[PDB]
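Can you give me the bound-state structure? Components:
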Amino acid sequence: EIIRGVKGKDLLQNNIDYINRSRSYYVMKIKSNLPSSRWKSDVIRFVHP
Amino acid sequence: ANTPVNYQLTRTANAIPEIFVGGTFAEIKQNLIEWLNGQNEFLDYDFEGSRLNVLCDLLAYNTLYIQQFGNAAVYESFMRTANLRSSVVQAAQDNGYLPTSKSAAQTEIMLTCTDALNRNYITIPRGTRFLAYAKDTSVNPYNFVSREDVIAIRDKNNQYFPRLKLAQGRIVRTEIIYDKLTPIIIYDKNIDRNQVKLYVDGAEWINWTRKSMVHAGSTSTIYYMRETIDGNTEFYFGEGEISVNASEGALTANYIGGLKPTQNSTIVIEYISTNGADANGAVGFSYADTLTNITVININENPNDDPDFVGADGGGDPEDIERIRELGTIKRETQQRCVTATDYDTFVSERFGSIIQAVQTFTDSTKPGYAFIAAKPKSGLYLTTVQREDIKNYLKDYNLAPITPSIISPNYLFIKTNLKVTYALNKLQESEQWLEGQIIDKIDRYYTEDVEIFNSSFAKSKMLTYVDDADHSVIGSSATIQMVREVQNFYKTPEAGIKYNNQIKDRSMESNTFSFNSGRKVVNPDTGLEEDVLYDVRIVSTDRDSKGIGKVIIGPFASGDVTENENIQPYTGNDFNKLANSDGRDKYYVIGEINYPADVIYWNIAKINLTSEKFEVQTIELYSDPTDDVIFTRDGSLIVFENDLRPQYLTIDLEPIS
Amino acid sequence: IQAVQTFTDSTKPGYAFIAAKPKSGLYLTTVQREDIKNYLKDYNLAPITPS
Amino acid sequence: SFAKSKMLTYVDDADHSVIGSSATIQMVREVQNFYKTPEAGIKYNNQIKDR
Amino acid sequence: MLFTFFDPIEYAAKTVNKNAPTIPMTDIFRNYKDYFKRALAGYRLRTYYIKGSPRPEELANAIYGNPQLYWVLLMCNDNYDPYYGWITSQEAAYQASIQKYKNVGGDQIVYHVNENGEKFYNLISYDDNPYVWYDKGDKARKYPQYEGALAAVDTYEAAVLENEKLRQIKIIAKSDINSFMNDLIRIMEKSYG
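Here's the bound-state model for the whole set.
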C-alpha cells in the first residue's frame, strides 16, 4: 500500500532510486575513518563472518 | 621505496626472552669467568692462571649441564616454542584442539545382495569386515569393517542393494569395569580417537569434542580423551557435577557426577585400530564377512561417481608438529563453534586433517549464505562427493544457522612436463628403472615441501633441484613445463573467461584435440549406415596482436560442416597454428579472443552457432606455455603435483650415460 | 515457552527462527514476542537478526 | 662435465630470498685462428643444435 | 632416582634458532607425577611429622633408610620447589624473610591477628585507643573496622609460621615402599612401549 506515517534518513541527494543497489544490497555495511585494506584482512580474520 | 621505519614492529617474529638462550660453553665460562671476577671477596685472584681456570671451567660445565634443562623446559613450557610433539598436543589439547592418531582409511560402498531368506528388511550389522587390496597390489587385502548398522528395503525382483560406508581396520571393543582410583588406558597403537565410540552400561556417551556435542543429551553423558606421553590413549570423563552445576533442570537437585562406580556402569568401549595412510586408493574390494542368509551378488565400487576417485581414504601419519603447532591457537582463539573463515579453515583441519593437506575457506561475495571451501584431499585434488557431503554436514554442525557450507575443489593449474635427466651407468650399480621411481618421489617432495603450502609463485628450476639431488649419480637433469588448466565447458568460456596469472608466449596458447561430430555422412563397405562423419579439432590461439590480444582460432573444419554466415567467416589468417589432419580441411573460425597482458581468455561456440552436442566431450584440458620462468598463483588457482591420477601431465625422459 | 525450537532458512540470511508454545495458549501471545526479542536482542550476531 | 643444474644449486643458495632462477647457456669456444680452422678442427665434445 | 630410569633423549634446540645442534639428555619430560599416581593409588599415604629442619633427602634417609628415595617423599609432598618447599631453619627463614622484605622494608609488621586467630591485614590503631583500629590509608578518624586487643605479627615470626606449616607430610609406609616400587616400575614399561 501507500504508506501513511513518515520518518527520514538523511542523504546528500536524498532518496530517488539512489543507484546500483546490489543483491538485495543490504549485505551489511561498515563505516570508519581508517582506510580499508588496513582493516580489511583482520575483521574477517576476527569478527566479520 | 621498500620499508622506511620508525623504531617499528616488535621483538623479531616471535618471543625469545633470550636470557634463556643456551650460549656457547666458552662464552658461558667467558661470561661466568667475569662473574667470579670483580667479586669483592677477592680482586686478587687471576683467573687466566690455569689452576683456577680449569676449576672455574668446571662450574660452567655443570652450569651448562644444568641450563639446557632450564632452557629447554621453557621451549617446552610455551606452545609454538615446544620442541616435543607430545608436549605440543598437551597445550593444544589444553587449548581445546587435539591432533589425532592415524585416522582409518574410509570409503562407502553400495552392494547389491540377495537375501536367501527374502525377508522384507535385512540389516548389515555394524562390524562386518571387508577386504581391499591396496592399489595395484593384491598380495594382501586391507581389511576394513562395516562402520554401522544399515538395512535395506527388499526391492521387487527380490534383488536390492543396501549401501554403506566403510572405514578400515577391525572393530575392537573392550569392556572395563570402571573404578574410582585407576587410569583407563588403551595401550592399542593404530587406535584413532575419531573412530572411538563406547558404551557405559547401556547408552553411549560422547566425548563432547567433535562427536555431535549439540543434542538434548544434557551433557551428563560425556567423557574426554588424553594422550599418555607413552603414545597410547587413556580415557577420561568429568567427575562430580558432570553437568554444568547444581540444580539445573532437575527439581530434586542434589549431586550427580555419575560412575560411582562401585561396580556400576561397567564401561565397554568399541574402536578400530588401523593400518592406514598405507591403504589409500584401495579399489578392489571383497565381501569379507558372511551373514545369515545374505549373499552379495555384486559389490560395485563408488556410488555417485566423482568420476575420478580412488579406493578408501584417510589413514594418516598421524603426527605433524608444524601443521599442528600454530594451528590450535586459532582453536584456542576461536570458540568450539566455528565462526571466522580461518576458524572454518582450522576447524576443518581438525576432522579430515589427514584427509586435507590444505583447506581454503573463503566467501564468494556473490552467494551469501554459503561457506566456500577449497581443500586438498591430499591423496588427490578431488574429495569424493560423499566426503564433501560428509564433512560438510559434520562441519555444518558448527556454523551460523543461515549460513551453509559450500565445498568445491578450486580449479588447478597443472604443470605438464617432460624431464631430461642424465646419469652415469657405471656410477650406479642400482637398477636404472628404480631411479626413476626414486625421482618420482622427490618431485612431489618439493611440492609438499613448498607449493601446496602457500600456493605462491612456483619455481620450475628450484623444483628441479631436488630431483637433481636424487641419485647424485644422476649426471644432469632437464625439464620443460607446459602450464595446464582444465576447462569445464568447451562450448562456452566461463563468463569471466580464464586467466593464467602468468605471462605466456603468444601463439603458444594451445588446447587439446578432440573429435567433433559433423552432420556429413560416412559409409564404407561392410560398415553399412555408419551414423555420419566425425573428425577432431582443438582450440588454437592466433598470434599476438597489437595491444597484446589474440583471437581464438577453432580447429580445422571441412567444407559444409559449418553453415557459412555472412557474419562468420573462415578466419583463414596466415599466422594461426594448425594441427596436421588427413582431411586437409582449412576452414578455421574465430570462436573467441584473448589478450596476452591480461592473460584473460574468452570464447563462445554460440558465436560459430555450432551445436554443443555435436561435440562429444564436455571438458577439455588446456595447454599453454608461460613465457616467464616461475609460475604465479593468486586465488583458487594453484599449481599442484598429481602424477598418479594424471600421469600424462607428468613425464620424465631418462638419459643413460656411461 | 514450553519448548523453544530454533531454526533458519538459507534462502534468507540475517535472520533466525525459534518455535514457541507459551503453553498458556495454542499461539504464542504477542506481549511475550516483544518482551523476549527485546531481552534476546542483547546478544544478536551483528549480521543476523533473530526473529 | 658442467651442469647447469648443479651450478643452479649455489645461485639458489646465495640469498634465501630468491624465489626462483633460470638461465639460457651458450658454450663459448673463442678461436685464435680465423682464416684456417685448425686443420684438425675444433669440437665441443657436445653436439649442438642446427644453425 | 627416576630420570636415570628412562632412556635419555636427544633434544634439538630448534625454535631458539632455525639451526642449533641436537643434544641428548636425561628425560625430565616424562611427567612421573601421573606415573606416581596410578601406582600410588594402590595403597595409601600416611601423614607424618618432621623432628627438625632437615633436608628432604637427608630426612628421606631416616624414614626409609635409603637416601636415594627423596622424590617418593617429594611427590607425596608434591611441592612446587625442593628448595623452598621444605622445612627450613629459623636462621634461613628470617634471612629469607629479611631478603624478601628488605627492599620493601625490614621488620615490616605484616598483619594484625586477633585473639581468635583471625589475621587482620593492613590495619593500624589511631593510638588514642590502641584497642580501636581504624586500619590505614584512612588517616583513621573514621571507620575503625575493629576494636579490641589484637596481636600483630613480626615478619620474622611471620616467616616462622609459613615454614611451620611444612612440618607434617603425607608419606607412604616404609613397608610398602618396596612393594610399591616394583609396580610403578612395571607401569613404566607399559609407559615405554
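A couple of observations. The radius of gyration of chain D is 17 Å. The CA atoms of residues 37 and 47 of chain D lie 18 Å apart.
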